[PDB]
Design a protein around this ligand. Structure first.
Ligand SMILES: *[C@@H]1O[C@H](CO)[C@@H](O[C@@H]2O[C@H](CO)[C@@H](O[C@@H]3O[C@H](CO[C@H]4O[C@H](CO)[C@@H](O)[C@H](O[C@H]5O[C@H](CO)[C@@H](O)[C@H](O)[C@@H]5O)[C@@H]4O)[C@@H](O)[C@H](O[C@H]4O[C@H](CO)[C@@H](O)[C@H](O)[C@@H]4O)[C@@H]3O)[C@H](O)[C@H]2NC(C)=O)[C@H](O)[C@H]1NC(C)=O
Ligand SMILES: CCCCCCCC(=O)OC[C@H](COP(=O)(O)O[C@@H]1[C@H](O)[C@H](O)[C@@H](OP(=O)(O)O)[C@H](OP(=O)(O)O)[C@H]1O)OC(=O)CCCCCCC
Ligand SMILES: *[C@@H]1O[C@H](CO)[C@@H](O[C@@H]2O[C@H](CO)[C@@H](O)[C@H](O)[C@H]2NC(C)=O)[C@H](O)[C@H]1NC(C)=O
Ligand SMILES: CCCCCCCCCC
Ligand SMILES: CCCCCC
Ligand SMILES: CCCCCC
Ligand SMILES: CCCCCC
Ligand SMILES: CCCCCC
Ligand SMILES: [Cl-]
Lengths: 199, 170, 135, 51
């Protein structure tokens, strides 16, 4: 009843952004939407002029620094399926170091954000990568459990078949995992990116 | 301490706003960064770890634990160099020259570990099957030949990568 | 899993109770849309008002207090600390299924689990003040 | 240690005495590892000595 605000030009034209003056680092200013309205309060009614700047986050930094190390760690863990089953300390080193690296990435992912109590897409991706790495570790553990004799193939021996000195056969678990784990990880990546990028 | 002022410039003009034109003076400096700090901090560990990664070629194929420890430690050191770099920079969305160099070094150590895995798979994986059945690339049956080929190729490829990187970014 | 009752007290600085007396209106404290609030780690349960008289050297002052009840949200800390610690404990359990002849493998597994648990221990307390009691 | 050596100092463009000390120590470590690689290259038989 005392003071009323309005836009000089039309509301869209009354909020102008300078072309060169864009100080955003990891955001794209798609545009602005302008509006005017009223608000109630214990003191009375007030005319309030509102603007809304629409900002889309830039995924390049996170793709470089979090998602891609996670994928490389997953691939590193899955590489363990190709070494011989008698390479117990080596495959244990793969599993242990990959799990530690994924734990470190999980810890460092939350640093960029505020301490919100809900789970994000990055958190779900890290969780699934951790599940894949831990699954590879348990796969190696089962392979070692089913390993019969603890000495590897000499190389010169003419191995007999599978229906003197005997040798272990190539693990069926390893043979299946070599084609199962990368395929499942790729399908998960496809589903995740298709779900999240298009929205 | 970091930069050096290559030159400075003065400009006078008129800038136009909705209210009207106004006078404008601009004092600009063209700063050029110094590379000694980065050479000491990020690069030189990266190259030295890259030479560290190639020691696995000279170790015998049967000694699996040594080569695996070497490869995994090199990957870990590349990752910790990268994270201790990115902790002190803004969240820019595009790859920098130092990021490209770190990715190249990471790729090199990754190929070192992967070609060790390939040698192990050739020996222990295809070995019994082949036995029951019974620069140019090497023959894919002789692990010693594969190791020699890696020995002579990895330094050459790394030197070529460094050459193109420096001649492009300098 | 902590719930706090944070106060907000105000009174007249110079005028004692004999000079100025504060009183709450019927609609004392009004809370608006509580979804546009900066509270990330806490959830607002409710609030209450109180009035008291505080004895000081200068005189007696009518102090009006508003308490806000805040309950912590454990989702973030569950992601940060609880889940990795349990996963590392399971990683330690995985050492049992390894063949006992794999001495370096099992020793490396155990010691690395100890490393990660110590790291998580020191990292869990970064967000907290340096209090001298067990949480 | 080399990465965390100069956290507090300004990003100067010259090597300090601490930098030279760190470089020489890392050179010693790298030389030790190369020496071990050389020694292992001339290990003919891969079984240790029995009591
Ligand atoms: C850091 O980055 C900034 C931003 O890019 C750099 O700043 C720019 O520097 C250049 C010079 O290096 C500046 O260019 C000039 O402007 C001056 C002053 O001009 C103004 O006044 C004129 C007279 O009042 C007016 O006519 C101009 O108007 C437009 O007019 C001309 C002619 O119609 C037109 O062609 C232009 O498009 C102008 O936009 C303007 O309002 C001017 O004197 C300079 O002229 C030089 O070039 C002419 C050749 O045509 C030559 O004959 C002259 O003798 C003179 O040599 C030049 O046009 C520019 O304005 C700066 N921009 C900003 C935003 O500051 C800065 O240089 C960078 N740092 C470093 C260290 O380089
Ligand atoms: C979470 C817990 C899960 C528990 C999972 C438990 C999974 C499970 O129970 O594995 C059983 C077995 C393992 O296969 P596996 O390669 O280890 O087969 C044994 C192994 O090859 C030994 O080496 C053989 O002795 P030898 O060296 O020749 O002397 C032995 O033959 P023999 O001594 O009899 O002559 C074989 O039994 O069969 C599968 O392939 C699993 C397919 C599904 C794998 C799916 C992988 C995706
Ligand atoms: C804030 O304080 C006032 C005064 O202490 C409380 O007032 C009472 O409110 C109830 C409910 O409206 C009335 O029935 C009482 O008569 C009021 N008090 C008096 C002295 O008249 C008020 O409820 C408090 N608000 C809270 C607790 O949120
Ligand atoms: C990293 C290059 C050094 C590796 C050791 C080479 C030993 C050669 C002995 C003939
Ligand atoms: C997500 C784990 C997949 C395991 C496939 C055997
Ligand atoms: C979830 C781990 C499965 C390992 C292969 C049986
Ligand atoms: C951080 C390493 C990324 C490697 C991409 C090829
Ligand atoms: C098939 C993997 C090859 C690794 C580089 C020689
Ligand atoms: Cl920003």
């Amino acid at each position: 009843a005392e003071v009323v605000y309005e836009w000089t030009r039309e509301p869209a034209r009354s909020v102008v952004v300078a072309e060169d003056g864009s100080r955003l680092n990891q955001y794209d200013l798609l545009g602005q939407t302008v509006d005017s309205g009223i608000v109630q309060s214990s003191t009375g009614e007030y005319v309030v002029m509102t603007t809304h700047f629409h900002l889309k986050r830039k995924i390049g930094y996170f793709v470089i620094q979090t998602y891609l190390p996670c994928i490389m760690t997953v691939i590193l863990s899955q590489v363990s399926f190709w070494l011989n089953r008698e390479s117990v300390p080596a495959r244990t080193v793969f599993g242990v170091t990959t799990v530690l690296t994924m734990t470190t990435l999980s810890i460092s992912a939350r640093n960029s954000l505020p301490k919100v109590a809900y789970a994000t897409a990055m958190d779900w991706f890290i969780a699934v990568c951790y599940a894949f790495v831990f699954s590879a570790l348990i796969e190696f553990a089962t392979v070692n459990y089913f390993t019969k004799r603890g000495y590897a193939w000499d190389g010169k021996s003419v191995v007999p078949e599978k229906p003197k000195k005997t040798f272990n056969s190539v693990s069926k678990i390893d043979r299946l995992s070599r084609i199962a784990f990368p395929l499942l990880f790729g399908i998960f990546n496809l589903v995740y990116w298709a779900t999240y990028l298009n929205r | 301490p970091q930069f050096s002022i290559v030159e400075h410039r003065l400009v006078s003009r008129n800038v136009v706003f909705a209210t009207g034109a106004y006078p404008r003076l601009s004092l600009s400096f063209r700063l050029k960064r110094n590379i000694g700090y980065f050479i000491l901090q990020t690069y030189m560990p990266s190259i030295l770890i890259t030479i560290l990664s190639w020691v696995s070629f000279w170790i015998n194929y049967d000694a699996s634990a040594a080569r695996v420890a070497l490869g995994i430690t090199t990957v870990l050191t590349m990752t910790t160099i990268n994270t201790h770099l990115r902790e002190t920079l803004p969240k820019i969305p595009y790859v920098k020259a130092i990021d490209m160099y770190l990715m190249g070094c990471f790729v090199f150590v990754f190929l070192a570990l992967l070609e060790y895995a390939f040698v192990n798979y050739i020996f222990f994986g295809r070995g019994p099957q082949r036995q029951k059945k019974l620069i140019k690339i090497p023959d894919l049956t002789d692990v010693n030949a594969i190791d020699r080929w890696s020995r002579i190729v990895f330094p050459f490829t790394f030197s070529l990568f460094n050459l193109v990187y420096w001649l492009y970014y300098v | 899993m902590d719930e706090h009752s944070c106060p907000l007290e105000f009174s007249s600085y110079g005028y004692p109770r004999e000079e100025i007396v504060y009183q709450w209106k019927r609609s004392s404290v009004e809370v608006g849309d509580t979804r546009s609030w900066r509270l990330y780690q806490f959830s607002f349960v409710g609030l209450r008002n109180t009035t008291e008289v505080v004895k000081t050297t200068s005189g007696d002052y009518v102090v009006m207090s508003v308490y806000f009840d805040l309950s912590r949200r454990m989702g973030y800390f569950t992601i940060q600390t609880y889940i990795p610690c349990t996963l590392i404990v399971v990683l330690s359990w995985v050492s049992f299924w390894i063949n006992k002849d794999a001495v370096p493998a099992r020793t490396s597994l155990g010691i690395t689990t100890v490393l990660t648990m110590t790291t998580l221990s020191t990292i869990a307390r970064k967000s907290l003040p340096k209090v001298s009691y067990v949480t």
